[PDB]
Design an enzyme around this catalytic site. Structure first.
Site, PDB file in Angstrom:
ATOM      1  N   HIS F 200       0.801  -1.229   0.000  1.00 35.82           N
ATOM      2  CA  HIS F 200       0.000   0.000   0.000  1.00 35.82           C
ATOM      3  C   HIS F 200       0.831   1.276   0.000  1.00 35.82           C
ATOM      4  O   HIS F 200       0.252   2.364  -0.089  1.00 35.82           O
ATOM      5  CB  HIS F 200      -0.963   0.023   1.196  1.00 35.82           C
ATOM      6  CG  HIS F 200      -2.020  -1.030   1.149  1.00 35.82           C
ATOM      7  ND1 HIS F 200      -2.763  -1.384   2.254  1.00 35.82           N
ATOM      8  CD2 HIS F 200      -2.503  -1.762   0.120  1.00 35.82           C
ATOM      9  CE1 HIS F 200      -3.636  -2.313   1.913  1.00 35.82           C
ATOM     10  NE2 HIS F 200      -3.499  -2.561   0.624  1.00 35.82           N
ATOM     11  N   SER F 204      -1.181  -0.554  -6.713  1.00 34.91           N
ATOM     12  CA  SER F 204      -1.184  -1.653  -7.672  1.00 34.91           C
ATOM     13  C   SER F 204      -0.723  -1.225  -9.063  1.00 34.91           C
ATOM     14  O   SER F 204      -1.157  -0.197  -9.591  1.00 34.91           O
ATOM     15  CB  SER F 204      -2.583  -2.257  -7.764  1.00 34.91           C
ATOM     16  OG  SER F 204      -3.025  -2.721  -6.504  1.00 34.91           O
ATOM     17  N   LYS F 226     -16.568  -6.594  -6.606  1.00 36.79           N
ATOM     18  CA  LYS F 226     -15.859  -7.471  -7.542  1.00 36.79           C
ATOM     19  C   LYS F 226     -15.241  -8.676  -6.823  1.00 36.79           C
ATOM     20  O   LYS F 226     -15.376  -9.829  -7.269  1.00 36.79           O
ATOM     21  CB  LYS F 226     -14.799  -6.676  -8.304  1.00 36.79           C
ATOM     22  CG  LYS F 226     -14.346  -7.350  -9.585  1.00 36.79           C
ATOM     23  CD  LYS F 226     -13.572  -6.410 -10.479  1.00 36.79           C
ATOM     24  CE  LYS F 226     -13.015  -7.142 -11.688  1.00 36.79           C
ATOM     25  NZ  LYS F 226     -12.369  -6.233 -12.669  1.00 36.79           N
ATOM     26  N   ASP F 227     -14.568  -8.436  -5.694  1.00 41.36           N
ATOM     27  CA  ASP F 227     -13.970  -9.531  -4.939  1.00 41.36           C
ATOM     28  C   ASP F 227     -15.025 -10.435  -4.316  1.00 41.36           C
ATOM     29  O   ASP F 227     -14.803 -11.646  -4.188  1.00 41.36           O
ATOM     30  CB  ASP F 227     -13.043  -8.973  -3.859  1.00 41.36           C
ATOM     31  CG  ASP F 227     -11.694  -8.548  -4.408  1.00 41.36           C
ATOM     32  OD1 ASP F 227     -11.426  -8.792  -5.603  1.00 41.36           O
ATOM     33  OD2 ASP F 227     -10.897  -7.970  -3.641  1.00 41.36           O
ATOM     34  N   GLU F 270       1.801 -35.589  -3.657  1.00 38.79           N
ATOM     35  CA  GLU F 270       0.642 -34.762  -3.960  1.00 38.79           C
ATOM     36  C   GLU F 270       0.907 -33.938  -5.214  1.00 38.79           C
ATOM     37  O   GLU F 270       2.052 -33.612  -5.536  1.00 38.79           O
ATOM     38  CB  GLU F 270       0.333 -33.849  -2.774  1.00 38.79           C
ATOM     39  CG  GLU F 270      -1.081 -33.311  -2.741  1.00 38.79           C
ATOM     40  CD  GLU F 270      -2.115 -34.397  -2.531  1.00 38.79           C
ATOM     41  OE1 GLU F 270      -1.813 -35.374  -1.817  1.00 38.79           O
ATOM     42  OE2 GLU F 270      -3.229 -34.274  -3.083  1.00 38.79           O
TER      43      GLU F 270
HETATM   44  C1  HEM Z   1      -0.211 -16.676   1.416  1.00 34.54           C
HETATM   45  C2  HEM Z   1       0.332 -16.232   0.284  1.00 34.54           C
HETATM   46  C3  HEM Z   1      -0.032 -14.853  -0.313  1.00 34.54           C
HETATM   47  C4  HEM Z   1      -1.032 -14.028   0.021  1.00 34.54           C
HETATM   48  C5  HEM Z   1      -2.118 -14.256   1.091  1.00 34.54           C
HETATM   49  C6  HEM Z   1      -0.943 -12.853  -0.819  1.00 34.54           C
HETATM   50  C7  HEM Z   1      -1.788 -11.767  -0.801  1.00 34.54           C
HETATM   51  C8  HEM Z   1      -1.774 -10.721  -1.699  1.00 34.54           C
HETATM   52  C9  HEM Z   1      -2.839  -9.769  -1.927  1.00 34.54           C
HETATM   53  C10 HEM Z   1      -4.192  -9.743  -1.199  1.00 34.54           C
HETATM   54  C11 HEM Z   1      -2.456  -8.909  -2.870  1.00 34.54           C
HETATM   55  C12 HEM Z   1      -3.322  -7.734  -3.393  1.00 34.54           C
HETATM   56  C13 HEM Z   1      -3.251  -7.556  -4.909  1.00 34.54           C
HETATM   57  C14 HEM Z   1      -3.667  -8.809  -5.625  1.00 34.54           C
HETATM   58  O1  HEM Z   1      -4.548  -9.536  -5.104  1.00 34.54           O
HETATM   59  O2  HEM Z   1      -3.126  -9.069  -6.728  1.00 34.54           O
HETATM   60  C15 HEM Z   1      -1.119  -9.290  -3.283  1.00 34.54           C
HETATM   61  C16 HEM Z   1      -0.342  -8.670  -4.230  1.00 34.54           C
HETATM   62  C17 HEM Z   1       0.900  -9.093  -4.636  1.00 34.54           C
HETATM   63  N1  HEM Z   1       1.512 -10.285  -4.302  1.00 34.54           N
HETATM   64 FE1  HEM Z   1       0.983 -11.494  -2.756  1.00 34.54          FE
HETATM   65  N2  HEM Z   1       0.143 -13.003  -1.652  1.00 34.54           N
HETATM   66  C18 HEM Z   1       0.726 -14.218  -1.366  1.00 34.54           C
HETATM   67  C19 HEM Z   1       1.835 -14.742  -1.978  1.00 34.54           C
HETATM   68  C20 HEM Z   1       2.606 -14.106  -2.919  1.00 34.54           C
HETATM   69  C21 HEM Z   1       3.658 -14.717  -3.702  1.00 34.54           C
HETATM   70  C22 HEM Z   1       4.011 -16.213  -3.550  1.00 34.54           C
HETATM   71  C23 HEM Z   1       4.169 -13.772  -4.514  1.00 34.54           C
HETATM   72  C24 HEM Z   1       5.311 -13.819  -5.561  1.00 34.54           C
HETATM   73  C25 HEM Z   1       6.150 -14.842  -5.746  1.00 34.54           C
HETATM   74  C26 HEM Z   1       3.455 -12.542  -4.237  1.00 34.54           C
HETATM   75  C27 HEM Z   1       3.668 -11.326  -4.842  1.00 34.54           C
HETATM   76  C28 HEM Z   1       2.745 -10.309  -4.919  1.00 34.54           C
HETATM   77  C29 HEM Z   1       2.901  -9.077  -5.658  1.00 34.54           C
HETATM   78  C30 HEM Z   1       4.143  -8.704  -6.484  1.00 34.54           C
HETATM   79  C31 HEM Z   1       1.797  -8.346  -5.486  1.00 34.54           C
HETATM   80  C32 HEM Z   1       1.483  -6.957  -6.080  1.00 34.54           C
HETATM   81  C33 HEM Z   1       1.564  -7.007  -7.598  1.00 34.54           C
HETATM   82  C34 HEM Z   1       0.707  -5.940  -8.230  1.00 34.54           C
HETATM   83  O3  HEM Z   1      -0.067  -5.262  -7.511  1.00 34.54           O
HETATM   84  O4  HEM Z   1       0.798  -5.765  -9.470  1.00 34.54           O
HETATM   85  N3  HEM Z   1       2.509 -12.779  -3.266  1.00 34.54           N
HETATM   86  N4  HEM Z   1      -0.737 -10.396  -2.546  1.00 34.54           N
HETATM   87  O1  LIG Z   2      -8.214  -7.507  -2.357  1.00 36.60           O
HETATM   88  C1  LIG Z   2      -7.363  -6.492  -2.216  1.00 36.60           C
HETATM   89  C2  LIG Z   2      -6.907  -6.143  -0.971  1.00 36.60           C
HETATM   90  C3  LIG Z   2      -7.394  -6.720   0.319  1.00 36.60           C
HETATM   91  C4  LIG Z   2      -8.912  -6.633   0.482  1.00 36.60           C
HETATM   92  C5  LIG Z   2      -9.338  -7.125   1.862  1.00 36.60           C
HETATM   93  C6  LIG Z   2      -8.874  -8.564   2.105  1.00 36.60           C
HETATM   94  C7  LIG Z   2      -9.318  -9.110   3.447  1.00 36.60           C
HETATM   95  C8  LIG Z   2      -9.049 -10.427   3.793  1.00 36.60           C
HETATM   96  C9  LIG Z   2      -9.434 -10.938   5.020  1.00 36.60           C
HETATM   97  C10 LIG Z   2     -10.095 -10.121   5.907  1.00 36.60           C
HETATM   98 CL1  LIG Z   2     -10.589 -10.758   7.452  1.00 36.60          CL
HETATM   99  C11 LIG Z   2     -10.378  -8.810   5.596  1.00 36.60           C
HETATM  100  C12 LIG Z   2      -9.987  -8.312   4.366  1.00 36.60           C
HETATM  101  C13 LIG Z   2      -7.358  -8.644   1.925  1.00 36.60           C
HETATM  102  C14 LIG Z   2      -6.945  -8.163   0.542  1.00 36.60           C
HETATM  103  C15 LIG Z   2      -5.868  -5.099  -0.859  1.00 36.60           C
HETATM  104  O2  LIG Z   2      -5.365  -4.784   0.214  1.00 36.60           O
HETATM  105  C16 LIG Z   2      -5.397  -4.386  -2.125  1.00 36.60           C
HETATM  106  O3  LIG Z   2      -4.552  -3.501  -2.030  1.00 36.60           O
HETATM  107  C17 LIG Z   2      -5.974  -4.788  -3.396  1.00 36.60           C
HETATM  108  C18 LIG Z   2      -5.582  -4.146  -4.570  1.00 36.60           C
HETATM  109  C19 LIG Z   2      -6.144  -4.503  -5.782  1.00 36.60           C
HETATM  110  C20 LIG Z   2      -7.095  -5.497  -5.839  1.00 36.60           C
HETATM  111  C21 LIG Z   2      -7.495  -6.146  -4.684  1.00 36.60           C
HETATM  112  C22 LIG Z   2      -6.943  -5.803  -3.447  1.00 36.60           C
END
Ligand code: HEM
Ligand SMILES: O=C1C(=C2CCC(c3ccc(Cl)cc3)CC2)C(O)=C(O)c2ccccc21
Ligand SMILES: CCCCCCCCCCCCCCCCCC(=O)OC[C@H](COP(=O)([O-])OCC(O)COP(=O)([O-])OC[C@@H](COC(=O)CCCCCCCCCCCCCCCCC)OC(=O)CCCCCCCCCCCCCCCCC)OC(=O)CCCCCCCCCCCCCCCCC
Ligand SMILES: CCCCCCCCCCCCCCCCCC(=O)OC[C@H](COP(=O)([O-])OCC[N+](C)(C)C)OC(=O)CCCCCCCCCCCCCCCCC
Ligand SMILES: CCCCCCCC/C=C/CCCCCCCC(=O)OC[C@H](COP(=O)(O)OCCN)OC(=O)CCCCCCC/C=C/CCCCCCCC
Ligand SMILES: CCCCCCCC/C=C/CCCCCCCC(=O)OC[C@H](COP(=O)(O)OCCN)OC(=O)CCCCCCC/C=C/CCCCCCCC
Ligand code: HEM
Ligand SMILES: O=C1C(O)=C([C@H]2CC[C@H](c3ccc(Cl)cc3)CC2)C(=O)c2ccccc21
Ligand SMILES: [Zn+2]
Lengths: 104, 54, 32, 81, 56, 378, 45, 55
Positions: F200, F204, F226-227, F270
């Site tokens: 943040h 994005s 949307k989500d 798996e």
């Molecule tokens: C438990 C595992 C993960 C969780 C819960 C998680 C969660 C998130 C969430 C909620 C976002 C918000 C934007 C979106 O949904 O695209 C995000 C963005 C992003 N995630 Fe994670 N992520 C995880 C693992 C990873 C991994 C494995 C990678 C890369 C190898 C990664 C790299 C990124 C990047 C680069 C962004 C921002 C990219 C953009 O906004 O263009 N994340 N992640």
């Molecule tokens: O979904 C998200 C998001 C977030 C929304 C709320 C989610 C969330 C998950 C669990 C709980 Cl208990 C509350 C909120 C977590 C991801 C987040 O921070 C962004 O910055 C974002 C940017 C682009 C598109 C989607 C997102």
């Protein structure tokens, strides 16, 4: 020699394949804004800056609407304007000069 | 048949329960899609213009 | 100056529920 | 930090919008959306599909070869006695 | 002019948030029962003769 | 001011998901992070329930799961949900990674590195859960994964024996698996919060790879609904997998309890692991095999360093796109090879697939980027 | 990089060499003392 | 809460799962506690404002 016409041919092919012209965009619009590019954008005169901003917003709106411009309005390969290149070259020269001072 | 039952007692009730909750989850897709479309129509029909003093 | 202003037409997007005009405005609003 | 008050500097752009309750949610599907999807498929077909076709050929070949390898060779018993 | 169905529905029920919520709880009470009964009927009908409820 | 902005906790929530400025034009590929979070939450809940009936002892583990699935009221569906949720979790994870490789979002360095950490943690967790039933496949999986540290030249064997707590795999190891599997998900949660904190600060990226600060919209209501739509879809798929076809991904060899004296003739982990297994199978040397196994994932950390393009996204870069999809097919090939016996056709095919994977990431993409630059005349 | 080839960088590295090998000594002896590493500690009188 | 007609085996595993999970909730709430504290700062023995002599 012919080699010029041949290379320009493949270059035009690559340009039409890229497709940013379908959105109404110039090549210099599509650069990623690293440090030097941001400084070159700072140096633009007002008219160029405003034209760039509107063009970019318009492309974003089209992308939102999963649409493209009419073919009549696509950017053509033979009449494009590399408006940002000159400023960028100067920025890069300045940085190179400073680096070279830093090793003495 | 008896070995099938010995390996998986939840069989009949599982299929029973599928009918219900699959009907529900199938119903919820178009409704929420409509809600999304409603909220996004503002942007989907937006019109821009550029008017510099020139 | 500004006086040349005019919103472009939205005919393609508007609902038929207001184009079939035989009902007061605010009652229509309520139906929609 | 990043906040809707001071993101960037813009001049001389005009916008127009309707309210959601004034307009339709799915206005024109079969007269506009379908052809658009069709061109959208056209523009990416040859950048994605042939690699997967090659994968499919490789998979089927390798399966066939492995399955041939498990069948008995007549020359292993017929040749010398 | 034209007292139409959805307009009456808006003005009587949906205009006020409390009453909207009340409408929702009342609708779910009856939907639940109707929906259960229909599903159970269909299920029972698909495989008559094979359930121990009737073999009993 | 509104209460929305009256208070630190509330104002952090507001900056997170009410008045956050998001790009207008991002697509479905950006929904998979929220689905990942959902999956984490689902796993924690269903796990806390299962935990209260499972037995971390080699003389009752198997039978405790039998007890869960036969006598506990609706315990069978809770089991089903846990097991299928893990699969969904990895599906979303893979798609989430691939997006960022395609659209150039690795240039957000901190987010990318925390993502790599999260990938590693999730894999550890999933594997340590897979051995708890103490079936015939679980046992030998444990065995292999704990012998991996024997490859460390000076101190390895001692590390193996210190993780076992004895001369061999046994009761003292199962309780270790269970304690670690209990604690890891919460570390994952905390690191996810750090991940989003880092995100943040910049905001994005988007499909075009150009700056979107002229067309930002608020997160609420647009991306909220949307989500929610995305979540509804995920739940439909998950329910159909849980109730209509539960045995689709299931393995029969884990319905036979463990036998320390016999390894079964056909071995298969798996599905989300097969590819690593194939890589591990492809090197005729122990140490080299393990090294390759770990480098296969650790290589993501130098992708930002090998980036030569002037443009960020592949949207406007066709040669690049062609290579991207070829890489994806190499990974499919490794997955397919992992399923097959260790016999000659598959041996040779796997070796080619591995060399092409590393080749492509390390050499071909950089060079195509330079060619592309030259074709656009900069 | 190619930037860090030149006179100033050579001088600057020479300035820090001694501190570097002293910290190396600290780390090595500490590791050995912490893991009762007999390979090194058997030579200490 | 018993999971049966009386205290028994099903209750002990519940005690153990809950005893495992609670400390971490305690940790998170401690962080919130300190977040709240640092918005004002520490009171002191005299009960009068110390903003003239902060270290
Ligand atoms: C438990 C595992 C993960 C969780 C819960 C998680 C969660 C998130 C969430 C909620 C976002 C918000 C934007 C979106 O949904 O695209 C995000 C963005 C992003 N995630 Fe994670 N992520 C995880 C693992 C990873 C991994 C494995 C990678 C890369 C190898 C990664 C790299 C990124 C990047 C680069 C962004 C921002 C990219 C953009 O906004 O263009 N994340 N992640
Ligand atoms: O979904 C998200 C998001 C977030 C929304 C709320 C989610 C969330 C998950 C669990 C709980 Cl208990 C509350 C909120 C977590 C991801 C987040 O921070 C962004 O910055 C974002 C940017 C682009 C598109 C989607 C997102
Ligand atoms: C018993 C079990 C029963 C199970 C029942 C399951 C039922 C599931 C119902 C699901 C309904 C979903 C509805 C969603 C609505 C969302 C609306 C929305 O906003 O969408 C946006 C979203 C797109 O987002 P976006 O913003 O455009 O961004 C995306 C891209 O960036 C845009 O980039 P682009 O524009 O460049 O891309 C253009 C083009 C790009 O095109 C290409 O790349 C080219 C493609 C060419 C293909 C050509 C044909 C094939 C190849 C042939 C090649 C030749 C071979 C020759 C061989 C030779 C050999 C010798 O891509 C598209 O247009 C794609 C559109 C189609 C998407 C399909 C999605 C499939 C989902 C499958 C789910 C499966 C799991 C179900 C559960 C199972 C449980 C057991 O999707 C759409 O727009 C499409 C919505 C409609 C999708 C319907 C899918 C129905 C699936 C039914 C499956 C039933 C069978 C299941 C089998 C299971 C087996 C185990
Ligand atoms: C991975 C396991 C093995 C790891 C082994 C670790 C080996 C290295 C151990 C080094 C210990 C000594 C380091 C001293 C550094 C002092 C730096 C400094 O700022 O000092 C001045 C500071 C401030 O002093 P000052 O402010 O009064 O003045 C300093 C000014 N000068 C420097 C000019 C004099 O002093 C401190 O407060 C330092 C406190 C250090 C406390 C360290 C506790 C010991 C922890 C390590 C030992 C335990 C390892 C257990 C391993 C078990 C394995 C099974
Ligand atoms: C006995 C059976 C159960 C009975 C249950 C009865 C309750 C049913 C559910 C009611 C839900 C709440 C609806 C009304 C909420 C009103 C909130 C309110 O007034 O606060 C709004 C206002 C908004 O803030 P600003 O933006 O600054 O406003 C400035 C405007 N220019 O204040 C706030 O910030 C919100 C405050 C929220 C207070 C919520 C109180 C909830 C009380 C719940 C009681 C439940 C009792 C259950 C009893 C069970 C049996 C023992
Ligand atoms: C239970 C068994 C599970 C098996 C494994 C499941 C996961 C793997 C699935 C592989 C197949 C995925 C196919 C996805 C649909 C592809 C559609 C397609 O080609 O569309 C191209 C279309 C073109 O659009 P643009 O270039 O943006 O321009 C259009 C606007 N004018 O969209 C794209 O190219 C978007 C691509 C986004 C990334 C997709 C990634 C898919 C694969 C990811 C997982 C692969 C494994 C892990 C990879 C990383 C490993 C380090
Ligand atoms: C990212 C989060 C998690 C993942 C990926 C995960 C994954 C798994 C997997 C794959 C299994 C084996 C499934 C099977 O054998 O059919 C399992 C079992 C188990 N997990 Fe989880 N898990 C997670 C979170 C948790 C948590 C937080 C707990 C808390 C106690 C937990 C408790 C258990 C228990 C008791 C079992 C054994 C029961 C069984 O095999 O059905 N899990 N886990
Ligand atoms: O022979 C193996 C084997 O080689 C692995 C392997 C698969 C890859 C795993 C892996 C380790 C590290 C990472 Cl980062 C990813 C996957 C380690 C265990 C198994 O999972 C397995 C399961 C059951 C029986 C036998 C076996
Ligand atoms: Zn049920």
């Amino acid at each position: 020699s012919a080699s010029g016409k041949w290379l320009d041919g493949i270059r035009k092919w690559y340009y039409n394949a890229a497709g940013f012209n379908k959105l109404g965009l110039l090549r210099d619009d599509t650069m990623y804004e690293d440090e030097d590019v941001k400084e070159a954008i700072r140096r633009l005169p007002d008219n160029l800056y405003n034209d760039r901003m509107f063009r970019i917003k318009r492309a974003l709106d089209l992308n939102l609407k999963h649409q493209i411009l009419p073919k009549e309005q696509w950017t053509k390969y033979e009449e494009e304007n590399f408006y940002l290149e000159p400023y960028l070259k100067e920025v890069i020269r300045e940085r190179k000069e400073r680096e070279e001072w830093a090793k003495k | 048949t008896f070995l099938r039952w010995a390996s998986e007692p939840e069989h009949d009730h599982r299929k029973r329960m599928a009918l219900k909750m699959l009907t529900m989850m199938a119903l919820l897709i178009p409704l929420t899609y409509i809600m999304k479309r409603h909220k996004w129509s503002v942007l989907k029909s937006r019109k821009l213009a550029y008017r510099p003093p020139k | 100056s500004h006086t040349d202003v005019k919103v472009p037409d939205f005919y393609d997007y508007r609902r038929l529920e207001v184009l079939d005009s035989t009902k007061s405005s605010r009652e229509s609003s309520e139906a929609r | 930090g990043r906040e809707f008050g001071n993101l960037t500097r813009i001049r001389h752009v005009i916008s127009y919008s309707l309210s959601p309750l004034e307009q339709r949610a799915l206005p024109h599907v079969l007269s506009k959306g379908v052809p658009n999807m069709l061109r959208r498929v056209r523009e990416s077909f040859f950048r994605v599909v042939p690699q997967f076709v090659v994968f499919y050929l490789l998979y089927t070949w390798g399966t066939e070869e492995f399955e041939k390898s498990k069948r008995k060779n007549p020359a292993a018993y017929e040749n010398d006695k | 002019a034209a007292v139409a169905f959805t307009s009456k529905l808006y003005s009587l029920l949906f205009r006020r948030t409390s009453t909207f919520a009340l409408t929702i709880v009342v609708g779910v009470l009856f939907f639940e029962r109707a929906f259960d009964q229909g599903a159970d009927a269909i299920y029972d009908h698909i495989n008559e003769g094979k359930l121990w409820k009737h073999i009993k | 001011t509104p209460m929305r902005k009256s208070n630190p906790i509330m104002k952090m929530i507001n900056h997170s998901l009410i008045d956050l400025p998001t790009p207008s034009n991002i697509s479905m590929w950006w929904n998979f992070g929220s689905l990942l979070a959902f999956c984490l939450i689902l796993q924690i809940i269903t796990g806390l329930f299962l935990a209260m009936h499972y037995s971390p002892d080699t003389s009752s583990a198997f039978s405790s799961i039998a007890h869960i699935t036969r006598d506990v009221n609706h315990g069978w569906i809770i089991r089903y949900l846990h097991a299928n949720g893990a699969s969904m979790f990895f599906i979303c994870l893979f798609l989430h990674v691939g997006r960022g490789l395609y659209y150039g979002s690795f240039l957000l360095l901190k987010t990318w590195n925390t993502g790599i950490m999260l990938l590693f943690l999730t894999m550890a967790t999933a594997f340590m859960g897979y051995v708890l039933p103490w079936g015939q496949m679980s046992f030998w999986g444990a065995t292999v994964i704990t012998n991996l540290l024997s490859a460390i030249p000076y101190i390895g064997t001692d590390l193996v024996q210190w993780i076992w707590g004895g001369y061999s795999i046994g009761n003292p190891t199962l309780s270790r698996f269970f304690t670690l599997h209990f604690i890891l998900p919460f570390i994952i949660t905390a690191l996810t919060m750090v991940h989003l904190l880092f995100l943040h600060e910049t905001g994005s990226n988007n499909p075009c790879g150009i700056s979107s600060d002229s067309d930002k919209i608020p997160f609420h209501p647009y991306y909220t609904i949307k989500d929610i739509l995305g979540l509804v879809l995920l739940l439909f798929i998950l329910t159909t997998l849980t109730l209509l076809s539960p045995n689709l991904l299931n393995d029969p060899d884990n319905y036979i309890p463990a036998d320390p004296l016999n390894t079964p003739p056909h071995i298969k982990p798996e599905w989300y692991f097969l590819f690593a297994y194939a890589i591990l199978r492809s090197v005729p040397n122990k140490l080299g095999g393990v090294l390759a196994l770990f480098l296969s994932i650790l290589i993501l950390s130098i992708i930002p360093t090998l980036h030569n393009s002037k443009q960020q996204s592949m949207m406007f870069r066709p040669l690049s796109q062609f290579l991207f999809w070829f890489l994806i097919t190499t990974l499919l090939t490794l997955t397919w090879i992992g399923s097959q016996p260790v016999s000659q056709p598959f041996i040779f095919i796997g070796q080619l697939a591995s060399t092409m994977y590393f080749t492509t990431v390390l050499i071909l993409m950089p060079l195509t980027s330079l060619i592309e630059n030259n074709l656009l005349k900069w | 990089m190619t930037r860090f080839l030149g006179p100033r960088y050579r001088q600057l590295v020479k300035n820090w060499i001694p501190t570097a090998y002293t910290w190396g000594a600290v780390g090595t002896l500490g590791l050995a003392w912490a893991a009762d590493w007999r390979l090194i500690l058997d030579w200490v009188p």
